[PDB]
Design an enzyme around this catalytic site. Structure first.
Site, short mmCIF file in Angstrom:
data_model
loop_
_atom_site.label_atom_id
_atom_site.label_comp_id
_atom_site.label_asym_id
_atom_site.label_seq_id
_atom_site.Cartn_x
_atom_site.Cartn_y
_atom_site.Cartn_z
N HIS A 91 0.85 -1.20 0.00
CA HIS A 91 0.00 0.00 0.00
C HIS A 91 0.88 1.25 0.00
CE1 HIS A 91 0.17 -0.49 4.46
NE2 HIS A 91 -0.14 0.79 4.56
N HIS A 142 1.52 3.81 2.13
CA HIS A 142 2.16 4.41 3.31
C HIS A 142 3.69 4.20 3.32
CE1 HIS A 142 -1.85 4.30 5.76
NE2 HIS A 142 -1.73 5.42 5.07
N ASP A 184 5.76 2.84 5.33
CA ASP A 184 6.31 1.55 5.74
C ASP A 184 6.27 0.55 4.58
OD1 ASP A 184 3.51 1.45 5.96
OD2 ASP A 184 3.53 -0.03 7.55
N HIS A 242 -7.34 -1.52 5.79
CA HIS A 242 -6.43 -0.57 6.41
C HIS A 242 -6.26 0.65 5.51
CE1 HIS A 242 -2.67 0.99 8.18
NE2 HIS A 242 -2.21 1.00 6.94
N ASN A 302 -3.55 3.06 13.04
CA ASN A 302 -3.86 4.20 12.19
C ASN A 302 -5.02 3.94 11.22
OD1 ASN A 302 -3.80 6.51 10.65
ND2 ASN A 302 -2.03 5.86 9.43
ZN ZN Z 1 -0.42 1.77 6.34
ZN ZN Z 2 1.63 -0.47 8.40
#
Ligand code: ZN
Ligand code: ZN
Length: 227
Positions: A83, A85, A87, A148, A179
């Site tokens: 995804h 983000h 990380d 998520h 989150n």
């Molecule tokens: Zn994420």
């Molecule tokens: Zn994550």
């Protein structure tokens, strides 16, 4: 023996063998006085490696490549980010500098751009709709729907029945969703159910953060979400 934040000195990366030709990689990162661990995957294909997700930023991702060369000694030739983000795509420019062909879904590329995050160079086609699945080297890439994040992907290694759930799946010890600013809580249960139905023979399920477990992490995630 699975690495945690209290055995990884930030800036360093560990590998953990999961099955034949499959490792997780584990790194640590600090946001606002808080430190986390994060997982990704490494999958062998003949004499090359497919990387799933960065090690959460440029410094960690440099260390990841060094650790791969030390322990495995085969080249990372392609990567998938699961995804948008940091990380997952933080460190993509490190991968690019190292000559890795970097991939993710078109939607993830768009979201990463909108967010001001690093953007993988190439799109995985045919992953636009929930339920969509594609083969990519030794893995299947599955878009199970929003959870998520609206773009989150999962990766399955069929030869050894390893399911990498990424941040769509919570580790057993988590009681909160973390989150949820980009999450779709209403959809997350149905997305998990689609993962359950698609990969009923998985033996190992690896969450985006924390300890691997088995198929029980999927229903656990659904339970955590319902709050
Ligand atoms: Zn994420
Ligand atoms: Zn994550």
């Amino acid at each position: 023996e699975y690495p945690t934040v209290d055995d990884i000195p930030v800036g360093e990366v560990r590998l953990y063998k999961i099955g034949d030709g499959v490792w997780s990689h584990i790194a640590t990162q600090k946001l606002g006085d808080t430190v986390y661990s994060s997982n990704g995957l490494i999958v062998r294909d003949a004499d090359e490696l497919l990387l799933i997700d960065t090690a959460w930023g440029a410094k960690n991702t440099v260390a990841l490549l060094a650790e791969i060369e030390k322990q495995i000694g085969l080249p990372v030739t392609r990567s998938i980010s699961t995804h948008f983000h940091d990380d997952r795509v933080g460190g993509v420019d490190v991968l690019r500098a190292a000559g890795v062909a970097t991939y993710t879904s078109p939607l993830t590329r768009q979201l990463a751009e909108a967010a001001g995050n690093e953007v993988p160079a190439h799109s995985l086609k045919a992953l636009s709709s929930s339920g969509d699945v594609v083969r990519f080297g030794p893995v299947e890439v599955f878009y199970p729907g929003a959870a998520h994040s609206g773009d989150n992907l999962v990766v399955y290694v069929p030869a050894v029945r390893v399911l990498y759930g990424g941040c769509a799946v919570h580790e057993a010890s988590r009681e909160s969703a973390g989150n949820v600013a980009d999450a779709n809580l209403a959809e997350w249960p149905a997305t998990i159910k689609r993962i359950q139905q698609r990969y009923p023979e998985a033996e190992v399920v690896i969450p985006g953060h924390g300890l691997p477990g088995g198929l029980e992490l999927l229903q656990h995630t659904t339970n955590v979400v319902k709050t």
